[PDB]
Amino acid sequence: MPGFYEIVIKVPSEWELPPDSDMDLNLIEQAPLTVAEKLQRDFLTEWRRVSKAPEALFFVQFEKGESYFHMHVLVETTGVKSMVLGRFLSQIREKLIQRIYRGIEPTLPNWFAVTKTRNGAGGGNKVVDESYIPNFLLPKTQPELQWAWTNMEQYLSACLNLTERKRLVAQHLTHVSQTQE
Amino acid sequence: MPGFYEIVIKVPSDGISDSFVNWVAEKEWELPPDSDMDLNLIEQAPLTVAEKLQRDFLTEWRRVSKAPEALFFVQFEKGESYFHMHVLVETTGVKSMVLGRFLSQIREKLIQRIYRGIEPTLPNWFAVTKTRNGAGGGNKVVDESYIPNFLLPKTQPELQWAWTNMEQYLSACLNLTERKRLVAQHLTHVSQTQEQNKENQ
DNA sequence: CTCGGCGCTCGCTCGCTCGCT
């Protein structure tokens, strides 16, 4: 398994759940999700271009925070060296503003932000390990959890199913537990 | 507001000999009547080369920039090591991304026209001012305050000559009491502005 | 003193711009 970049996108504050989902449609907010579906889809479209990675592994999760909606994008680093992630990410940020926001930049502070190895300045683009998904994304539960997308086989059935998340989390803790022997 | 590129050109202390007529040796400079400078401290032959450099640089600038009437301020100086010219030219018509290629056009022309195709020995004789002192910054844009801040304060013998089409510095180029006046006037504003900022928390 | 996060520097990277041929 490869490393991942994390880009977090804040989203300003009629879908169906797939048959296999156990989630509560009543707790998923329609309007913000529609914005998020465009952002993730278009991000990944541009991502595939700059990285020359048509099959790029990704996991995206849309969450409802205490102050704003935020979307975690995890893309495989293959094809995009850390040294050039910035110049490519700025191209993508611009596409979104044009395609989704009619070319009016969102008011939201820090609304499109890569995850660095440090809080201040001078850090590096963080290569997030894939265990980030069970350790930190899978355990989210409604209403905080709002939606998720992936092309990673392990998580197809997990995106929108709370039981399957629960299982994979536990499957992970077991594996962790196994290495400690 | 007008922004300015800054090119800095070194001039040597040097088919030019005193044993025969030539465009450098033959020139003799007078101060305009309004000037309070000391002509004995101004070096005639470097001055003469320096005048030709800035003159030609400018007309080549008006070509690439497609901007006749482009604002400029140029000042020739005698330093510890070399003579040098600070050329300030308005950015209009030249996007920073293409300054280089145009500056190299001009640099080559000056080498052919003034140096007869023999590239100057001097180490970094034609260099544009960047936003950082090392590699990888952009071409610097300064505003007019750079003139009262860093060029007007010079006195002789460091100050040799100045040329400008800028209304406000016409009389200052070669009048020292004029420079002094404008420097005080500027510093006063800068000082009040400093106070005002400190008091604005 | 030790410790550690933060602000910041600077040699360096490398996809992009665009006048030129």
Place this chain on the structure above:
DNA sequence: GAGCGAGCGAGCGAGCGCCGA
């Protein structure tokens, strides 16, 4: 038109001095 390539400069990030704990 096509595409070369010097010049571009935002981005990078290990390293380090500072400062409050």
